[PDB]
Amino acid sequence: DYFLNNKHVGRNVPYSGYDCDDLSVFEMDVQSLISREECLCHSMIQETLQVMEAAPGTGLPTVGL
Amino acid sequence: IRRYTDQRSLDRSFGLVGQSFCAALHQELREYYRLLSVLHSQLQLEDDQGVNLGLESSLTLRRLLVWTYDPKIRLKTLAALVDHCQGRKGGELASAVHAYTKTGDPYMRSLVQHILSLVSH
Amino acid sequence: AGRQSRTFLVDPNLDLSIRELVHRILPVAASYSAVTRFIEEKSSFEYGQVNHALAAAMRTLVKEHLILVSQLEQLHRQGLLSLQKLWFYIQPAMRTMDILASLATSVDKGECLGGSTLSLLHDRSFSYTGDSQ
Amino acid sequence: AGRQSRTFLVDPNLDLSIRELVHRILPVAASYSAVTRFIEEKSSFEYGQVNHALAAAMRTLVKEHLILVSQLEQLHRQGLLSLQKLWFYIQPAMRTMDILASLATSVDKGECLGGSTLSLLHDRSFSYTGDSQ
């Protein structure tokens, strides 16, 4: 939420250092989101190829028809 | 900032209030240098580990810019405060600090409030 | 030149299709540059606390954008980033930056200050009633 | 020409045995083309929920047919596909497509709609009493 990570948006901001531990956490979270999208893409690709890669005449939904 | 601190650390005529302001500035500078050291240690860890770990610690120009975005704002605020307080002492220094307290930025507001309270104590 | 959107020169020897894709993406970078310019200009104390707060919020979103860009840079360092993947990943970012830039340009054109800025914010919030993000 | 099965021109200089095999296989492709045409036309929203659903099912079966064809194409690209192997693998597929096309043509001749279409489907289901597939 834009306001949740808004550490520097506040009325009573406590004096803090420059410590970016939360920033590193946010970076990791965004990286995880991107990696999750990439993994979903790769999995979809792999599944679609594996379906497309079945033996000729194999994998047909109407078995024997 | 460091030039200003060195210039004012030697002036006994700056008085106790001036020395206190310099002390607060030195404390903030120490915090900044600690943060910079941590970032340096992370980049050094990324270089020394030899692994292209896409961790936030890998020294990218972009990663450096990201990690220094907030530090850049902090340092800019501190430098502007130093410039505005240049030549002011005593109650004039206190007035200059109070004038910087009227900033709208909550992060700048927090920093200036902490510095003001510490120097006024 | 002036308060205009940033223009880009593309190498003439680039693929025409590549050039068109670049011209499609460049609006995001123009929005980023405009937002940064607005943040740096309206951040002066003279622009009032409301403008300061606007700049701070923009700074937070810019931080998010920079984080995204750095992660994309890491993926590129891995060689895993294609131009089509880049477009796909930037499309949401493109829309977010475009919305932010439109708001910035409206505030700048209106020279909105204090209560007028709050009114403009209310009207823009109603203007984005259909875009949940 | 009209509501006829698609006709094909084969190069006359082909082997007579090859030409006859082609003419034996071409009926399957004609049925496929007719079925695809019916599916694409009756897929309009104007066709009502029953005819639309029928077309959607036909489209799904056409997709399965395309998948099979792509695998056979791969075997040919792999050099693993002989003409007799293709004929053998398509013979059941040819019969399935021919049955589906005959049903489509019967529905089209009857202009069956709604309950009449459902009745026709029931009667066709009884018509396949001997064909378990």
Cβ contact C–D (≥3 pairs, < 8 Å) = no
Residue type for B112, please?
V
> How far apart (Å, rounded) are the C-alpha atoms in residues C84 and C25?
11
Opening angle at CA B113, ends B110 and B116, nearest 5: 150
Token couple for C18: 């590549």
d(CA D102, CA D110) in angstroms, rounded, equals 12
| Residue D27 CB coordination number (10 Å) | 16
User: CA-to-CA distance for B96 and B17, rounded, in angstroms?
Assistant: 13
| Alpha helix segments (H runs only) across chain C | 16-42, 48-77, 83-110, 115-127
Length of chain C (residues): 133
* Per-residue DSSP letter, C7: P
Query: Which residues of chain A have a CB within 8 Å of the CB of C59?
Result: 8
How many Cβ pairs closer than 8 A exist between chain A and D? Answer: 34
Residues of B in contact with C77 (CB under 8 A): 52, 54, 60
Candidate from D80, D81, D96 with C-beta closest to A62: D96
Quote the CA–CA distance of B97 and B120 in Å, as a whole number. 9
B with D: touching (≥3 Cβ pairs within 8 Å): no
How far lies D78's CA from each of D72, D74, D75, D82, in Å? Answer: 9, 6, 5, 11
Q: CB atoms < 10 A from the CB of D6, how many?
A: 14
Alpha-carbon gap: B81 to the closest alpha carbon of chain C (Å): 12
Chain length of chain A = 65
Q: How was this structure determined?
A: cryo-EM
Whole-angstrom distance, CA of residue C119 vs CA of residue C102 = 16
* CA separation for the pair D28, B119 (Å, rounded): 92
B interface test, pick of C39, C45, C65 with most B CB neighbours within 10 Å? C45
What letter does residue C47 receive in the DSSP assignment?
G
Long-range CB pairs of C23-29 (<8 Å, 24+ gap) are: C24/C87, C25/C86, C25/C87, C25/C90, C25/C94, C27/C94, C27/C98, C28/C90, C28/C93, C28/C94, C28/C97, C28/C98
Flag whether residue D133 sits within 8 Å of chain A, measured between CB atoms.
Answer: yes
Resolution in A: 4.7
DSSP 8-class letter at B55? S
